[PDB]
Amino acid sequence: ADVQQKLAELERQSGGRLGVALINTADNSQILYRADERFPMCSTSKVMAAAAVLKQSETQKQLLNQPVEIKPADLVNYNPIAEKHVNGTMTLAELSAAALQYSDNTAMNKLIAQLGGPGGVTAFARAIGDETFRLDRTEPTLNTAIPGDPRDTTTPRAMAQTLRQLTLGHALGETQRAQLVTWLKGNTTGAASIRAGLPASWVVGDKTGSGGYGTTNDIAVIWPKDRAPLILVTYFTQPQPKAESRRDVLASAAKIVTDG
Amino acid sequence: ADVQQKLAELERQSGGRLGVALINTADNSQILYRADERFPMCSTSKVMAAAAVLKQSETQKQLLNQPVEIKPADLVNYNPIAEKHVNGTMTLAELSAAALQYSDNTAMNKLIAQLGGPGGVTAFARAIGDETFRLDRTEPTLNTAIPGDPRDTTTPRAMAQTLRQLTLGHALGETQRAQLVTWLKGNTTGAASIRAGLPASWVVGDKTGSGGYGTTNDIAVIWPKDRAPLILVTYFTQPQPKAESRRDVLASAAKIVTDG
Ligand SMILES: *C(=O)/C=C/N[C@@H](C(=O)O)C(C)(C)S(=O)O
Ligand SMILES: *C(=O)/C=C/N[C@@H](C(=O)O)C(C)(C)S(=O)O
């Protein structure tokens, strides 16, 4: 509508490539912008991995309480939670929360190892009907974000659809779906991103990501004041190897698509 | 010097009044800017209330498990957590988390009432050697933030000092101190405020606030990469009752005072 002109303006003024998918669950309407292009997911991939471990825990009923050893060698680049338990252990519930709410990279690595490798995360994507998602690498190299590289990519449309099934749909058993939403709603890293663009009264759960070429991402489930929930995926990447993050672009994108 | 001039330049362009107080616990140095002027606290006052409840919990030893009834008449203007428990209950631990991490205003009112009113929160401030802090009203009117009004105000210097004692000192017992810091570290609302101004590797716990006159506040305990923690208060208020919030200003303030 004007939504398209505005998104195009934002994109041009930003110097980057912008990807947006909104699903409105009141009526299944969508707002799409480069929705079928691939973008590096970076840490927004932590959602698929934690969900995969949730799913495992539907048949391995004590899985979330299993201790996992954190060695000095497991420490990656960003480890605000793991590094407090080195030469100690963390449960798989603790690791999921640390990956999701703090973006801890060591924690993500443990989730990936539990699933048997990046392949296992991709296998779960495929099990819930996501044929686009691909995880190929561990932290921190999954975040390289090199233009033209298909590794560790998905599309806004696929990720919105998947986030809808996981958070509001039936990809997970009910307890597990509640657990994921509880973890997402407690994210500590999202206030400058999608949230920044929404009315203060609306409630949000979301997972950010960032990486190379100033890749700046957010995926969110959103409960507007007095409306059915929305799903929003805002992905953004830039042409220079060491571009600065742009969480404000995401916020601008969320304001634009939710004003209507 | 360089920083005092930069702060003045930032304030000069902001359209408002900026209060800063930084304490570097490596050497107890300070950086101060309008640090003995009063500002309205808004929700940064929630720290003092949760800390008062923690203090109570040192002698009433299951206090944090105690259920509190939430009635429809309790709901204020912003209760993302409390509203799911109307005609039900929340524990004091849950009210604490809700007020700190989500800024739930019904939650804050239950903490105030557990302390005997706004007066009891002030009494606790006084018991830990804070002679500046004053809480006068309940939510939501505590955030009116009218220029010149002394209600519900403190100074950046008083709040920096208090925050240091609560989170790194011995104002509380050790478990209570750790509980507070854990709650601050899991704040969901801070990524666009002080955090936005600091390198991504630095770990932050904080409490934001906002209100009338475009008042935009953040107070934080910061664990920089490879340095002793800092304490930072950034307060900001504006001349028009309906001004928009300016979390960007706090971010910039944070960057100026941490650059070197
Ligand atoms: C999640 O999106 C990944 C976070 N890590 C990166 C970041 O930008 O925070 C690095 C650069 C620390 S690395 O890819 O781990
Ligand atoms: C904490 O700072 C509380 C915030 N409240 C206000 C805000 O600006 O967010 C309102 C307007 C929601 S209310 O006056 O409490």
TrEMBL record, chains A, B:
Main EC class the enzyme belongs to: hydrolase
A GO biological-process term: response to antibiotic
Catalytic activity: a beta-lactam + H2O = a substituted beta-amino acid
Beta-lactamase class A catalytic domain: residues covered: 20-234
Pfam annotation, one family: Beta-lactamase2
EC number: 3.5.2.6
UniProt KW keywords: Antibiotic resistance, Hydrolase, Plasmid, Signal
Taxonomy, superkingdom: Bacteria
Gene Ontology terms for molecular function: beta-lactamase activity
Transmembrane segments: none
InterPro entries for this protein: Beta-lactam/transpept-like (IPR012338), Beta-lactam_cat (IPR045155), Beta-lactam_class-A (IPR000871), Beta-lactam_class-A_AS (IPR023650), Cefotaximase (IPR058131)
Family: Belongs to the class-A beta-lactamase family.
Name this polypeptide is given: Beta-lactamase
Species the sequence originates in: Escherichia coli
Recorded name of the encoding gene: blaCTX-M-64
